[PDB]
């Protein structure tokens, strides 16, 4: 209890950021006091609350949270946080009415006593911001901001930094979103995580680690990226034993580390662990739930794959049931919650539960994973909510960066996903020693230009069906989606797609392959685009439902609009 305090409680003082700010936008206070309390992250301790009303009644119950301010510095290939001045409470908060609101702050600590501040208040203006991300009302395999425009995620998995840490993210996050990309995720655990909150104790929360968290994010809104954040992973509760880089013996969940459980299936439902899981959900809503570039809150990576000694399906499930509930109910902007598998198919039993918004796929698969990608599409609308392919990359223990320098794997996937009904891009890894090196970014940037201006929540879009090629040289093949005004197509390659030896690819416009037909009525304007420079390449109308393909080396992507 490095951070006990043993005095009367009391308010020393306030400071409050702005007085006025924009929808959306981040207020935040910063509270000084004296108590008495052994751990400021236990709110049965000493419990922080900030009360907001805005000029409609809607009341607003925030947690507030303890924290320390650091300065940032590199010794030579690390980071290094020098911490400045005594630590304190604060309160994050984000107005989602313009108008005014008023607030105070109420304090209690473990003696009972209570002591709340005068009532102030704050004006909010009108802001560019969309708002938080949401279920599509209008098509449940998408999702939307509270503007109502689409929220198409485009971007690849960004879980942690080197030794350099948020320096890192200096470099990556600016190449990612010029390059068309607003998403990454990010890993709070295991305890070696960049971000890690539970770095040497599940009751005490790493303040380092959540300053570095709180640096990406604010670079993420500067940049509008959005972040999915995944509390913990598999690793935790995996022995050495049992390989695929167990955590167990080292995880401060572990009585050996000072945590509360003597084998990680008691993690589903010791009383302890419970209490001090729900304190940390509060902890993460306190300090991060304020901001709209919180996508979304997953509560594992690949549960299923913890120690088989250790998973037991109902009790998983209604662990993430009442996790669910517990967050949904202290979450004021009720961010998006979800959870993963490492079993691509995933788990019916959880992926069904009405507390998580949206379902994902993991899938690390070396041959025709296209058809792979989309079989399990077509499998997961029967949850009829949004599916996100996480992760993904092929069955190459790690050597796709050797095996396929160009990208070519990530390229394949991500045309795949997003024209076969996925919310957006398969998820790739690899982010630090492939996407980032290779500099393979222009991938993402030539599919963004080619979907971005179409609203996917409008176009009752449908997995195509009913074609017919007429191609003699080759075997080509079409993933596809049909829409009430625009048809997508991307055709490769069933012979080239799976190479990855050779350089980028051409195409010859002047040149005739082939034709597909297709059930629709014309007359149509077709788009011919080319993935790769992420250019359109020839343009043409047609008076039939007969569109040709101009010769192509590996992969190619068709726009057609009914007229």
Request: with cysteine; proline share 5%.
């Amino acid at each position: 209890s490095r951070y006990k305090d043993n005095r009367p409680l009391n308010i020393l003082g306030i400071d409050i950021s702005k007085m006025e700010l924009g929808r959306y936008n981040l207020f935040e206070v910063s509270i000084f006091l004296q108590g008495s309390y052994l751990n400021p992250f236990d709110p049965q301790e000493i419990d922080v609350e900030g009360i907001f009303e805005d000029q409609y009644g809607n009341q607003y119950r925030v947690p507030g949270f303890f924290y320390q301010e650091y300065k940032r510095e590199l010794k030579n290939d690390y980071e290094y946080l020098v911490p400045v001045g005594d630590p304190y409470f604060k309160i994050r908060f984000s107005p989602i009415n313009i108008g005014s609101y008023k607030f105070f702050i109420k304090v209690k600590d473990k003696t009972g006593r209570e002591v709340s501040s005068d009532k102030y208040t704050i004006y909010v203006k009108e802001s560019e911001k969309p708002g938080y991300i949401r279920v599509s009302e209008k098509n449940w395999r998408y999702f939307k901001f509270d503007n109502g425009r689409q929220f198409l995620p485009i971007g690849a998995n960004i879980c942690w930094a080197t030794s350099k840490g948020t320096y890192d993210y200096d470099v990556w996050l600016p190449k990612c979103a010029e390059n068309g990309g607003n998403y990454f995720r990010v890993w709070l655990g295991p305890s070696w995580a960049t971000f890690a909150l539970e770095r040497e104790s599940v009751k005490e929360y790493d303040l380092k680690n959540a300053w570095k968290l709180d640096y990406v994010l604010n670079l993420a809104e500067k940049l509008n990226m959005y972040i999915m954040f995944c509390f913990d992973s598999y690793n935790e509760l995996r022995y050495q034993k049992e390989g695929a880089y167990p955590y167990w013996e080292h995880t401060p969940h572990y009585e050996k580390n000072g945590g509360p459980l003597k084998e990680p299936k008691d993690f589903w439902t010791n009383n302890e662990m419970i209490k001090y899981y729900k304190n940390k959900l509060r902890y993460i809503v306190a300090r991060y739930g304020y901001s709209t570039n919180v996508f979304a809150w997953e509560f594992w990576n690949q549960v299923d794959i913890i120690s088989p000694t250790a998973f037991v399906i109902g009790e998983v499930k209604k662990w993430h049931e009442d996790m669910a509930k517990y967050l949904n109910s202290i979450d004021p902007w009720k961010h998006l919650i979800t959870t993963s598998f490492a079993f691509s198919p995933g788990k019916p039993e959880i992926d069904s539960i009405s507390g998580l918004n949206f379902v994902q796929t993991h899938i690390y698969k070396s041959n025709r994973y296209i058809d792979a990608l989309l079989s399990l599409i077509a499998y997961k609308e029967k949850y009829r909510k949004p599916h996100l392919v996480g992760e993904f990359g092929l069955d190459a223990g790690g050597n796709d960066l050797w095996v396929d320098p160009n990208g070519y794997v990530i390229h394949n996937a991500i045309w795949t996903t997003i024209l076969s009904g996925a919310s957006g891009t398969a998820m790739s890894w690899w982010w630090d020693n492939h996407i980032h090196p290779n500099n393979l970014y222009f991938h993402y940037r030539a599919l963004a230009d080619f979907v971005k201006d179409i609203n996917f929540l409008e176009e009752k879009f449908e997995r195509l069906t009913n074609y017919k090629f007429n191609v003699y040289n080759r075997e080509i093949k079409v993933i596809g989606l049909q829409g009430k005004k625009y048809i997508l197509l991307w055709l490769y390659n069933a012979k080239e797609a799976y190479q990855y030896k050779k350089d980028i690819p051409n195409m010859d416009s002047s040149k005739f392959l082939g034709s597909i037909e297709l059930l629709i009525k014309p007359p149509i304007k077709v788009i011919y685009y080319d993935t790769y420079r992420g250019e359109k390449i020839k343009e043409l109308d047609l008076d039939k439902n007969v569109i040709p393909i101009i010769e192509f080396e590996r992969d190619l992507a068709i726009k057609i609009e009914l007229l």
